[PDB]
Amino acid sequence: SGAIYVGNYRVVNRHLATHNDWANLVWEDSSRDLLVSSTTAQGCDTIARCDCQTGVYYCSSRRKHYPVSFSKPSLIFVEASEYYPARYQSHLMLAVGHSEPGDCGGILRCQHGVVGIVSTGGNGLVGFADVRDLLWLDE
């Protein structure tokens, strides 16, 4: 679990969005596993606007942060799950690092700010949904 809180927005994994997220919907994209909802309070986070390919993510299943080298956002095949049919997920970045079911929502950061959130993984890989192209989160 986990979310990004920036301005009057909350960014979560679309498959973990709550009834309240859907009632306050701003934007969602199944192909990215992202949903953005509106908030009443001002958020604590800031968003990176960069092309970094290294950073640090939070791994809830280890209660620890780990450094990672990750691929640029791209279209990557994701096998069927209870939440989605077998499909290509867009704007996804992969890295070698531990993740297991339950780690979705952990934040990836570089020196410029928040880069994305954990969205998939397995077998020593971790995959992050990128948010750096969503320039409207800043206004």
Closer to ligand A1BO0 at the Cβ: 26 or 76? 76
Q: How far apart are CB 72 and ligand A1BO0 at their closest, in Å?
A: 18
d(CA 32, CA 119): 9
Instruction: List the one residue out of 126, 131, 113, 123 whose CA is nearest residue 55.
Output: 113
Which residues have CB under 8 Å from 32's CB, separation 6+? Answer: 14, 89, 90, 91, 92, 129
- Partner from ligand A1BO0, Zn ion, none binding residue 83, C-beta < 5-8 Å depending on class: ligand A1BO0
Interface segment toward ligand A1BO0; rule CB under 6 A; list 40-48, 49-57, 117-125, 131-139? 117-125
Binding test (CB under 6 A) with ligand A1BO0, winner from 3, 115, 118, 131: 118
d(CA 23, CA 132): 25
d(CA 91, CA 36): 15
Q: How far apart are CB 121 and ligand A1BO0 at their closest, in Å?
A: 3
CA dihedral (8, 27, 11, 111) positive or negative: negative
- Partner from ligand A1BO0, Zn ion, none binding residue 133, C-beta < 5-8 Å depending on class: none
**Hey, which residues between 53 and 112 contact ligand A1BO0 (CB under 6 A)?**
78, 81, 83-84, 89, 99-101, 103-104
* Cα angle: 66, vertex 91, 56; to 5 degrees: 15
45 binds ligand A1BO0 (CB under 6 A): no
In sequence order, what are the beta bridge partners of 121? 126
Binding test (CB under 6 A) with ligand A1BO0, winner from 12, 73, 91, 120: 120
Kindly list the catalytic residues.
15, 33, 104
